[PDB]
Amino acid sequence: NSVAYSNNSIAIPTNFTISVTTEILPVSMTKTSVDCTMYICGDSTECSNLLLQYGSFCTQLNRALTGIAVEQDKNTQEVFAQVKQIYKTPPIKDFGGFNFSQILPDPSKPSKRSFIEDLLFNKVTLADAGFIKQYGDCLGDIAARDLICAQKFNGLTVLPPLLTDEMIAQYTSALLAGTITSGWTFGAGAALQIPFAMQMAYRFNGIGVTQNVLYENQKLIANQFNSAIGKIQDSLSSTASALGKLQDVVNQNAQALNTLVKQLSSNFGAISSVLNDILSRLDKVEAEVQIDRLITGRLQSLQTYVTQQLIRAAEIRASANLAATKMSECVLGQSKRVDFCGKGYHLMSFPQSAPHGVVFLHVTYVPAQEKNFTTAPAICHDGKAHFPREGVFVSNGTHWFVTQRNFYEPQIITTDNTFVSGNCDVVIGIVNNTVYDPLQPEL
Amino acid sequence: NSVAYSNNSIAIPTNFTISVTTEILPVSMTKTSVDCTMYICGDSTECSNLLLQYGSFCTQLNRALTGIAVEQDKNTQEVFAQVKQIYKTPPIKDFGGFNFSQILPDPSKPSKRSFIEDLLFNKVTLADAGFIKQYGDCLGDIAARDLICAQKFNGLTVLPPLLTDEMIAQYTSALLAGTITSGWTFGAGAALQIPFAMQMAYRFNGIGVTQNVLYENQKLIANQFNSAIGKIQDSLSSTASALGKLQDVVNQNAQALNTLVKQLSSNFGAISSVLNDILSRLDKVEAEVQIDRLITGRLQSLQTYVTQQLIRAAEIRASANLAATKMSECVLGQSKRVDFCGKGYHLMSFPQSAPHGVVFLHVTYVPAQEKNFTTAPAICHDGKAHFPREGVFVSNGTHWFVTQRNFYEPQIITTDNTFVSGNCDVVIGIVNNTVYDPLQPEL
Amino acid sequence: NSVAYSNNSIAIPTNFTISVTTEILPVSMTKTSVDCTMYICGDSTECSNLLLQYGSFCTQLNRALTGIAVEQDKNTQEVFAQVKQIYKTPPIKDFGGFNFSQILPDPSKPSKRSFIEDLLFNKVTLADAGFIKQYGDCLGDIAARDLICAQKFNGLTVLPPLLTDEMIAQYTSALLAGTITSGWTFGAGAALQIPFAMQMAYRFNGIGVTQNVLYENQKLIANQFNSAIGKIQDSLSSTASALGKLQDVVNQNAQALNTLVKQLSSNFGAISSVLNDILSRLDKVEAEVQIDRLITGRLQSLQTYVTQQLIRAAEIRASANLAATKMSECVLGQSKRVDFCGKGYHLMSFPQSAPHGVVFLHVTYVPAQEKNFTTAPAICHDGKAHFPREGVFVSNGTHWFVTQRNFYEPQIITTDNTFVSGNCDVVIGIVNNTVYDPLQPEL
Numbered sequence A, B, C: 001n002s003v004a005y006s007n008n009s010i011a012i013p014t015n016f017t018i019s020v021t022t023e024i025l026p027v028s029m030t031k032t033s034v035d036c037t038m039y040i041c042g043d044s045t046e047c048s049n050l051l052l053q054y055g056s057f058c059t060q061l062n063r064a065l066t067g068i069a070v071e072q073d074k075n076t077q078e079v080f081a082q083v084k085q086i087y088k089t090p091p092i093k094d095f096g097g098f099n100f101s102q103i104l105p106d107p108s109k110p111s112k113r114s115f116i117e118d119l120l121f122n123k124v125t126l127a128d129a130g131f132i133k134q135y136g137d138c139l140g141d142i143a144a145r146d147l148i149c150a151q152k153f154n155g156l157t158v159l160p161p162l163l164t165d166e167m168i169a170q171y172t173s174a175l176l177a178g179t180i181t182s183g184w185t186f187g188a189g190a191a192l193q194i195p196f197a198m199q200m201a202y203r204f205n206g207i208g209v210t211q212n213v214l215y216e217n218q219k220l221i222a223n224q225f226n227s228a229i230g231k232i233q234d235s236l237s238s239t240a241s242a243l244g245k246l247q248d249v250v251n252q253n254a255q256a257l258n259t260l261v262k263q264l265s266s267n268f269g270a271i272s273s274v275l276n277d278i279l280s281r282l283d284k285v286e287a288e289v290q291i292d293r294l295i296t297g298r299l300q301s302l303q304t305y306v307t308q309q310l311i312r313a314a315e316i317r318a319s320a321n322l323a324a325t326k327m328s329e330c331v332l333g334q335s336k337r338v339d340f341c342g343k344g345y346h347l348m349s350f351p352q353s354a355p356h357g358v359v360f361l362h363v364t365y366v367p368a369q370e371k372n373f374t375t376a377p378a379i380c381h382d383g384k385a386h387f388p389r390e391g392v393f394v395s396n397g398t399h400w401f402v403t404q405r406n407f408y409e410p411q412i413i414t415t416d417n418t419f420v421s422g423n424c425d426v427v428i429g430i431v432n433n434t435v436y437d438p439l440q441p442e443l
């Protein structure tokens, strides 16, 4: 506000020089297209395959670059469909049909008491009726010690049936003596044959008791052998049956184990195949995500490029409007605007064609020599502050004149050159001068 | 079209007032940079690590914000490479080397017929030659019942060798009687010794047949014992061999089962490790995708911000062009345009520097009091419709004058103030007036 | 440069025609909002659920479309949080507690030497004392061949106790003869009883040796039976113990196998559940990535649409500024610009309201008939090259005049109509003419 009355210097030209100026204004823009495939993906196959799933955004970008507005609507052309091509998992069978059999888990608690008394079947054979060590040592080699040292039993008298040479000789001699005395004696002289019959009966009783002992021993051996053979047969049959049952159980367990091994191999193969497929899918997904990240980054870069191109197109349309108005105001007319039809005061302009632009040949005159003059916003001649019309107030140091800003022509301040505006109070900046008015035409 | 002759009121100013106006026009813009790391990721490490894979789009955004165009080319700087750091799967071994052995699967069908006839080896011993219950009950205690009740055989006569006291006494008495009668009789009186020899021979035959029976029984027992012992030895050896084979089979199966358990533990550990790695990778991928979604959203927001900044830069360049033309038309000249160098009719302007802008001090005069006047597009003075040049037609109610739109100065309609245009037929809006032309200069 | 003096033709109008022109200039824009949910997702639920994770970018887009700048700050509203809702893996138990027992793995190497000598326990019974085939064939049916063919032993004489009818008859006859001769002879006539006692003693010795052989055979059978029964009992007990131990081992192995099968089923079920969950998560991630790709593409399309809308808003603001300056220069004043307030030289303009725009009714006069004239940049009248001010130099073929570019009025070239500029050397294009200056006012 205070700079209004600061009597700033105004440059008023004095001389001019004709100058020719050439100006180029862009009107149209070269049609720029964008190939998103080559921009986002540089000679990459998987990149293009993944970009094919991003949609038809490149078509919208190209239509926006050509000058066609992008439509705002719903998804009547793009579908988020899925096919679910996932494979079915191989059947991992359950291990429930494997029943390993035992031998005697719980057979109603039989508890069979065998009680094999095979050791108790021993033959404790009874001895003989004697005459084994007593008679054998008492007789010796003397036949006279046969009758006087004859062994006996608990209620009988026994003698061994083994005779000797001297024994039978003495027996024959006694028999002959008895037979001789029987034919010559009437009393008891024939008693010599009594000991013969006595020892004969004793040997008979000995043979009988030995035969009885042997028969009892044979009966004992027979019954003991029968019982032992029966028990051995029973034990062997039971052992064979138990061994057969155990062998059947072992064979069943072995078959079940073979089947289990086969099913286990099948299940492990299925699990391995599933794991391999899962790992392949994981690797594919990781690679696809790592590619999509860079795809998104390059899409942001391409969107920035498209924004730049659209802003450039808008600026070129503005420059085309400027070229049209410059044509209308410089070629079809003489503009009074300063530094519009070139640089200076316009005289005449000529248009020239150009690729994507218009060339203007501006013929104007520039101020050769300029002089600074002290100016004021208004003067005051006894009130009624006057401001200049079609020109500015110019002072050379002592006098004030009115002239236009293009050329210096000092003219006296008259009423026909200025306009009154109120009084000299509101107008900031007041100088006192005299407004003459001759109005005297000559000739 | 019909509004042309609607005699619309035009505001013609009458008085003016000097006014000073200040205008600020932006020329340059403060250099704005974008830090994508801090904008997309607010103090987040994994966000920045994932953004590092999106590429160098931030460089292109900053270059676009600085005024450098984004290049449209292929991918000569970004590669979609991969290293495939996936680990190798632990070997899940197959269960094919486990062959559980059986005992007798198919040994060419031996079918060994044992036929153990151990029960048939019983000793059915034959009885004696009698004299066990018949002779024992017939004899009793009377020696006279020995010869008259003597038992016999099928073709012989047998007697037990067991004698008695009265029996041997009677035998001795008969022998003595026979020996006595032999020495006194010449005929058959010596027949008393016949029954003695008869019973002696009978006892001898009895001893012989008992010895034969015992010998046959001993032979039977011997052969039966030999056969039974042979069969028992065979059965025991076969049972021991079968038990040893079964024990070897069980031991082999147990070793195979231990090996199977070890291999099964190894395979399950490998599968568990693979599953843990797969789960970790899945969690990582899910987290990365969830982060990348918000990263893409914030990238869209940042792209919108960059678009706004670029449009603001374009508008500021347009405002700089406007400031340049305003400088040229207001400071270097006095513009005749209304409300361009401020607000009103321009007199003088002064430039002032400012940060990122130019300040203009416009000195102009605004219309103080305005008056509405009825105007017409053209008049008609006996044909040859006249339209005003350097001014408009203004009527105060009865008379029509010519004046400029900035100040009210009624002037008479003359030929030097108007221009003829055809006739009064095509021009829409026709009023009849008189175009005077004194052309009389005084003094 | 060379086209300046090319005497190009300038079109100077001669007649005019009043024309009314209507112009529409957009000022404001209809408030456009963007619904990202319906644009990116067309009637899709999972698409909207996934877009909800992209953030509040739609709010920023709408605020930018409304005219509010997008803020550039850190992430004080969006968090990249995670909850880690991953399930815990079912415990895959290890197979370490399964200890399959053997029978005799390494029991300090007992190596028990059984050495069952059951075959060596045979009864090789000794024969009798003869008289089985020799005496039986030598005796026959003649009692006389009994004493003369009597068998003997190695040191004794034995005879079988089996007599015959003729044998006992001859014995009785010899005994009777001896008893008769004993009573009538004094010498050795009683020797007839010697062979009787001899054969009696021989039969006694035979019975004795047969009894001894039978007793020895019974002792042999007894000891052999005892030893064989002991060995058989030992073997049976050992076999039963080994069979019981093997049965216990088989039962333990079967129980361990059942437990192993149960644990294996549990582990396989756990692995199957884990694999199913992993497959479900993989399918979900794949579908989500395939949706996010198209979401990103449509987001790029929407960003392009927003950029277009913002550029249109900027252009509409520029058109509003143009409408304001056209209002100020055509309605509030008469502009001297050609083809600015319509098409032609402006006379008066009238404003009319319109939805989102201002309608201008421009009243102007267009050049009816135009004539081409040869123009020059400057003339030369004895040096001091003159260029026209407020008009251009126009020649009709022989004479040069000064006139304005809007109407054809030939005026004589005077000093008050031209300006001197240096000399006729620098000014490109020089023509020689005469600059008159009458300055003679009449009347």
Ligand SMILES: *[C@@H]1O[C@H](CO)[C@@H](O)[C@H](O)[C@H]1NC(C)=O
Pocket (backbone or CB within 6 Å): A006, A007, A008, A009
């Ligand atoms: C006004 O005039 C004074 C007197 O010489 C001078 O000092 C001052 O600089 C002038 N103001 C301008 C040129 O703005």
Ligand SMILES: *[C@@H]1O[C@H](CO)[C@@H](O)[C@H](O)[C@H]1NC(C)=O
Pocket (backbone or CB within 6 Å): A098, A099
């Ligand atoms: C095996 O079979 C037996 C009888 O056939 C039955 O009692 C048992 O429950 C079964 N065990 C299994 C695991 O099927």
Ligand SMILES: *[C@@H]1O[C@H](CO)[C@@H](O)[C@H](O)[C@H]1NC(C)=O
Pocket (backbone or CB within 6 Å): A009, A011, A370, A371, A372
């Ligand atoms: C007029 O004033 C300007 C203001 O800086 C100055 O640059 C110029 O040299 C001055 N001209 C003369 C002739 O003094």
Ligand SMILES: *[C@@H]1O[C@H](CO)[C@@H](O)[C@H](O)[C@H]1NC(C)=O
Pocket (backbone or CB within 6 Å): A396, A397, A398, A399
């Ligand atoms: C200013 O112009 C007047 C008018 O011609 C003249 O008399 C005077 O000498 C000039 N110079 C000064 C310093 O006043």
Ligand SMILES: *[C@@H]1O[C@H](CO)[C@@H](O)[C@H](O)[C@H]1NC(C)=O
Pocket (backbone or CB within 6 Å): A420, A421, A422, A423, B014, B015, B016, B369
């Ligand atoms: C306003 O204009 C009228 C027109 O004649 C004039 O008489 C009057 O003095 C003016 N007033 C001011 C304050 O300029």
Ligand SMILES: *[C@@H]1O[C@H](CO)[C@@H](O)[C@H](O)[C@H]1NC(C)=O
Pocket (backbone or CB within 6 Å): A380, A430, A431, A432
């Ligand atoms: C102009 O004249 C008035 C009237 O006397 C006076 O008040 C004022 O100070 C004068 N101004 C100048 C600059 O001489």
Ligand SMILES: *[C@@H]1O[C@H](CO)[C@@H](O)[C@H](O)[C@H]1NC(C)=O
Pocket (backbone or CB within 6 Å): B006, B007, B008, B009
């Ligand atoms: C034209 O003049 C008539 C007569 O008073 C008036 O009613 C009408 O409003 C005028 N038309 C305008 C001012 O546009």
Ligand SMILES: *[C@@H]1O[C@H](CO)[C@@H](O)[C@H](O)[C@H]1NC(C)=O
Pocket (backbone or CB within 6 Å): B098, B099
């Ligand atoms: C086991 O071995 C036997 C003979 O050694 C053979 O016949 C059989 O096919 C084998 N079984 C397996 C499953 O290898």
Ligand SMILES: *[C@@H]1O[C@H](CO)[C@@H](O)[C@H](O)[C@H]1NC(C)=O
Pocket (backbone or CB within 6 Å): B009, B011, B370, B371, B372
């Ligand atoms: C001139 O006409 C305009 C049109 O609305 C009106 O606003 C204004 O008040 C009028 N002025 C006079 C002095 O009648």
Ligand SMILES: *[C@@H]1O[C@H](CO)[C@@H](O)[C@H](O)[C@H]1NC(C)=O
Pocket (backbone or CB within 6 Å): B396, B397, B398, B399
């Ligand atoms: C209009 O102007 C004329 C010309 O001076 C004048 O005679 C007349 O009184 C004014 N007013 C009317 C209503 O005509």
Ligand SMILES: *[C@@H]1O[C@H](CO)[C@@H](O)[C@H](O)[C@H]1NC(C)=O
Pocket (backbone or CB within 6 Å): B420, B421, B422, B423, C014, C015, C016, C369
């Ligand atoms: C066209 O201009 C010529 C120039 O003298 C004039 O004679 C003629 O009447 C004009 N015609 C029209 C229709 O304005």
Ligand SMILES: *[C@@H]1O[C@H](CO)[C@@H](O)[C@H](O)[C@H]1NC(C)=O
Pocket (backbone or CB within 6 Å): B380, B430, B431, B432
């Ligand atoms: C002007 O005069 C002509 C010639 O008689 C006549 O036809 C026309 O109606 C008049 N117009 C007016 C507005 O008086």
Ligand SMILES: *[C@@H]1O[C@H](CO)[C@@H](O)[C@H](O)[C@H]1NC(C)=O
Pocket (backbone or CB within 6 Å): C006, C007, C008, C009
């Ligand atoms: C200049 O005048 C010559 C002479 O007729 C003519 O051939 C040439 O075309 C003119 N140059 C123009 C019209 O630019």
Ligand SMILES: *[C@@H]1O[C@H](CO)[C@@H](O)[C@H](O)[C@H]1NC(C)=O
Pocket (backbone or CB within 6 Å): C098, C099
């Ligand atoms: C099984 O147990 C035995 C003794 O109880 C031991 O020596 C052996 O190492 C064990 N084996 C396993 C695999 O635990």
Ligand SMILES: *[C@@H]1O[C@H](CO)[C@@H](O)[C@H](O)[C@H]1NC(C)=O
Pocket (backbone or CB within 6 Å): C009, C011, C370, C371, C372
């Ligand atoms: C004036 O020159 C232009 C330039 O091509 C031409 O189109 C037009 O017809 C010419 N007019 C006359 C009247 O020769």
Ligand SMILES: *[C@@H]1O[C@H](CO)[C@@H](O)[C@H](O)[C@H]1NC(C)=O
Pocket (backbone or CB within 6 Å): C396, C397, C398, C399
């Ligand atoms: C050109 O204008 C002059 C000046 O009136 C005139 O004498 C002449 O006949 C016109 N035509 C030519 C061809 O000079």
